[PDB]
Design a protein around this nucleic acid. Structure first.
Ligand SMILES: [Zn+2]
Lengths: 129, 226, 122, 324
RNA sequence: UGUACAACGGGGUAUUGUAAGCAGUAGAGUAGCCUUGUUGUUACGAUCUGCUGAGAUUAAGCCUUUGUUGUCUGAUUUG
RNA sequence: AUGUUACCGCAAUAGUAAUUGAACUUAGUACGAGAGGAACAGUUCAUUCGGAUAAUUGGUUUUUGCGGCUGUGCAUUGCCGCGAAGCUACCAUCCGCUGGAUUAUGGCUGAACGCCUCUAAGUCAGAAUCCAUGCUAGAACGCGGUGAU
């Protein structure tokens, strides 16, 4: 079972990271001791630029996609269907492709506007003289 | 009908086992003597399921359910959870509970109609009990004890409480239950009656050290003889 | 995580505040080492503050919170917020009716009665 | 024991397992090169243990397995003074790795190693076939001469290693004929070793004290991984298409594009080291021997730092796009 | 005189945590200017935001290299 | 050093062989009126020892790797944030409870002597004793096979 890092949002694995449990039984997994010591100092990941609290709070990547509707922890279990398994495998591969495509094309929106503002700003370095 | 049973040189029964009308949950640890003991009792009528809950032999305190539903905590792994879903039929509902505490057999005691809960449970689990189990929910302490399952054993036959329960408290609580109550000892003086024994509407299973007066109490209030 | 001479919390509702361990039951014998308690360990512990009836008397107590990161069998390193123990008999039958705070999974697997009085497991 | 250093860095096999002549003719050991260590998730199937049907995480050691090739045989006859080889038999075409092994100054030698031996197949084989029939006739026990495909390995030494292997199949004549067909051809461990095999490891440990021959026994093989598999790091649970190679590769070693053996526990010696994998000297039946393990997940992250991904596709999927 | 070696270069992996510099109305406020404001705006303004998981390290005992470039030799001993 | 050289080996010989406990089951049975309660096997962990090991956990030296601090030429690694690599650690992990013949000693059944007895027949345990097996080293003046000259 893959969990996220509490401080990175990075996938936590067996053997990887430290868990802290408060008195209210809330488990917090950290992928590394940088995350763990950052939590020890009571720091905000919204302050640290590299972690995904800042990046999903900032708008570098898209954060809501219609591809995200498929990944969710389900508390009611489903009986075993072998025939749904390969369809879910194809779904995971295809949806990860579509997510990377939408993320790259979302970054493709960012780089075009600097051309426009560089045009508008190098007009200011010409038209004054 | 009351059968003394032992698990790994321990008289505790509801710790390692979970008994409803329609199924039984057993641990995988130690030996198949305790499982064959229930096979002698229950047999082919209801499915008896070996399980762990987040890698535990302790499952009756971890789980709280009726004939219609079964509630499992957050830490239940989905391999175990899929094995429980493939194990138990469509008539039994299974759902993980996202809440602070994990132990459910201490915190929720129920039958097919009425559940007593931890009076300081969150409201979401108080929703989910009456949703899945289809039972009536009451915030209540048995003699001021906030763990309601280990200190009070329930079925649709009747109920059994620990001996520190006042008779005023027994009537106060049996008005909510509409099934009778007896202050009872189990396993030679152990007040923990919910983990010391399990019961459903045709069977009560307890430890070896549950004495014959205690067995007469259980056989009377849960009507083990027809 | 706790050697001999360690103050730990009291998570049952008996009335003690803190439990001071003076001996560890079932520890090895090596020169200059300390008998170290951990999760799922019954040790002799004395009550420092609380009711004086529980004070000035040692009691056996099982540790439910450790706060030092151990290696569980499934891959995880994890530790509680603090150190905590609950006092009981040598038979493992609890004194407290309800044990507050999170109780360790190995400790509740070890003792059936502690799990019978456990409210919060992990 | 007095701690004097090892004689050769390739440690000697002083004892081999017992000859069963009712089994087909097959090897008894192997020489590989240890790449490194990682961590494996699997389920424990041990009734009597509380950890039965429970996820365990286990340290393993992986040895790179290039396919080994047979170039000769050696028959030993019994004397009242001990074992003695009456002769050794070579094949004709031997690599520059092996001809390098005989030489100290290969870079400036005229490379004259087995020239006139190649004239012994210029004939019909009369002396050679006389010797094969002699080892059929005499020489009760048979050892084969094998060397590794060290050019298929990230080792900087182009000089491969030669070793003897006692051949515990049946029929000395069929043994030497088996080796006769297997001259200059290859043998993989898949025909020799298998899954769940309790093996012993013979290796020279890490010098710094150290550099001593050590035989650590009873290690269950966990994966006989094939070189052509791109799902080397995969399981029926771990459906990623990934190799056994770590993220960034094995530290100070390189990679494994070859076959490999992932075996339980630890092992004497370091990385880049020649290690003999021998099958057990007896049929262990301890239930630690009989266990048919079933893996779940393979760590393939970086040990060059605190790793946080398994595949780089996972890395790009989490981190998204970059400025570069 | 070769999948040869080596100096670079490149790619991979990991470390640290947004480089320098540009822009601002974002900035607690102080003066300044009138068009005395229903954000009127111009100067100082620790800092903040976007360019920017950016910038820096990366084997000295990490891995790889269809790219470049140079290289290949003397002294002693034996039948 | 034994014409040389190189590899693969053999083995005269030297040493070396893991301590202690409890968890299921055999069991709530044999047994015992009960009280209570076995053991041989078959599984599971612990202690201790020995040997390895860095995947991970933790410590540690050389870091002068990244970012940052405090100054007056300096801070005995100036400090700190976050980290490598190596060494090391039941602080982390893995593997190793090798088999027979025996001495003293403790016994059984059991006559010789109608009681009696470890002995006369036979036999159980038990020393660092002896052998086997495995491991480590290899006669530097032990040996063999094989290459080219
Ligand atoms: Zn993290």
């Amino acid at each position: 079972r893959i969990y996220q890092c509490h401080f990175c949002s990075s996938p936590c694995y067996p053997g990887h990271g430290i868990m802290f449990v408060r008195n209210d039984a809330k488990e917090f997994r950290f992928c590394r001791s940088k995350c763990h010591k950052a939590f020890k100092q009571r720091r905000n990941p919204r302050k640290l630029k590299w972690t995904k609290a800042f990046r999903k709070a900032a708008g570098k990547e898209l954060a809501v996609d219609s591809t995200l509707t498929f990944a969710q922890r389900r508390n009611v279990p489903v009986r075993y269907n072998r025939e749904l398994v390969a369809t879910t495998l194809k779904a995971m591969a295809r949806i990860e492709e579509i997510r990377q495509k939408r993320e790259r094309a979302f970054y493709k929106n960012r780089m075009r506007g600097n051309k426009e503002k560089d045009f508008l700003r190098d007009k200011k370095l010409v038209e004054s003289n | 009908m009351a059968t003394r049973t032992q698990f790994e040189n321990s008289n505790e029964i509801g710790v390692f086992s979970k008994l409803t009308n329609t199924y039984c949950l057993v641990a995988v640890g130690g030996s198949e003597n305790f499982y064959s003991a229930f096979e002698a009792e229950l047999g082919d009528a209801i499915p008896i399921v070996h399980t762990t809950i987040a890698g535990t032999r302790i499952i009756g305190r971890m789980t709280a359910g009726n004939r219609r539903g079964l509630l499992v905590p957050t830490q239940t792994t989905d391999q175990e959870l899929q094995h429980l879903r493939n194990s138990l039929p469509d008539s039994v509902k299974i759902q993980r509970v996202e809440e602070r505490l994990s132990a459910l057999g201490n915190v929720i005691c129920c039958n097919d109609y009425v559940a007593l809960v931890h009076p300081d449970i969150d409201r979401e689990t108080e929703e989910l009990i009456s949703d899945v189990l289809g039972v009536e929910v009451f915030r209540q302490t048995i003699s001021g004890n906030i763990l309601v399952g280990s200190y009070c054993s329930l079925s649709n036959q009747g109920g059994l409480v620990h001996p520190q329960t006042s008779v005023q408290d027994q009537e106060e609580l049996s008005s909510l239950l509409q099934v009778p109550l007896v202050a009872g000892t189990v396993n030679r003086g152990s007040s923990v009656v919910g983990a010391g024994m399990v019961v459903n509407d045709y069977l009560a299973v307890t430890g070896l050290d549950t004495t014959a007066p205690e067995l007469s109490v259980i056989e009377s209030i849960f009507r083990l003889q027809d | 995580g706790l050697p001999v001479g360690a103050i730990m919390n009291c998570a049952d509702n008996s009335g003690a505040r803190n439990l001071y361990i003076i001996a560890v039951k079932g520890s090895g014998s090596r020169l200059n080492r300390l008998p170290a308690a951990s999760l799922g360990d019954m040790v002799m512990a004395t009550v420092k503050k609380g009711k004086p009836e529980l004070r000035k008397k040692v009691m056996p107590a099982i540790v439910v919170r450790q706060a030092k990161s151990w290696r569980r069998r499934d891959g995880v390193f994890l530790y509680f917020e603090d150190n905590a123990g609950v006092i009981a008999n040598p038979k493992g039958e609890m004194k407290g009716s309800a044990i507050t705070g999170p109780v360790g999974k190995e400790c509740a697997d070890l003792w059936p009665r502690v799990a019978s009085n456990s409210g919060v497991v992990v | 024991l007095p701690r004097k250093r090892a004689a050769s860095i390739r440690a000697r096999v002083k004892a081999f397992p017992k000859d069963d002549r009712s089994k087909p003719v097959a090897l008894t050991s192997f020489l590989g090169y240890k790449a490194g260590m990682t961590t494996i998730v699997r389920d424990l199937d041990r009734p009597g243990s509380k950890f039965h049907k429970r996820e365990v995480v286990e340290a393993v050691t992986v040895v790179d397995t290039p396919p080994v090739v047979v170039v000769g045989v050696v028959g030993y006859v019994e004397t009242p003074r001990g074992l003695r080889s009456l002769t050794t038999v070579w094949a004709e075409h031997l690599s520059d790795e092996v001809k390098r092994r005989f030489y100290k100054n290969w870079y400036k030698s005229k490379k004259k190693a087995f020239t006139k031996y190649s004239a012994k197949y210029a004939q019909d084989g009369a002396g050679i076939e006389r010797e094969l029939a002699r080892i059929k006739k005499y020489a009760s026990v048979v050892r084969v001469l094998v060397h590794t495909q060290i050019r298929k390995t990230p080792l900087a030494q182009k000089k491969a290693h030669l070793a003897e292997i006692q051949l515990n199949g049946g029929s000395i004549s069929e043994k030497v004929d088996w080796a006769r067909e297997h001259f200059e051809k290859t043998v993989a461990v898949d025909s020799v070793f298998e899954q769940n095999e309790m093996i012993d490891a013979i290796a020279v440990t890490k010098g710094h004290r150290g550099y001593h021959s050590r035989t650590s026994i009873n290690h269950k093989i966990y994966r006989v991984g094939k070189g052509d598999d791109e799902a080397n790091g995969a399981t029926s649970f771990d459906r990623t298409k990934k190799t056994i190679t770590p993220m960034g590769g094995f530290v100070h070693y390189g990679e494994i594009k070859n076959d490999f053996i992932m075996v339980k526990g630890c092992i004497p010696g370091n990385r880049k080291r020649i290690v003999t994998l021998r099958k057990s000297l007896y049929t262990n039946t301890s239930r630690k021997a009989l266990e048919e393990v079933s893996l779940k997940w393979i760590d393939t992250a970086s040990k060059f730092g605190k790793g946080r991904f398994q595949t780089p596709a996972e890395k790009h999927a989490f981190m998204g796009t970059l400025k570069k």
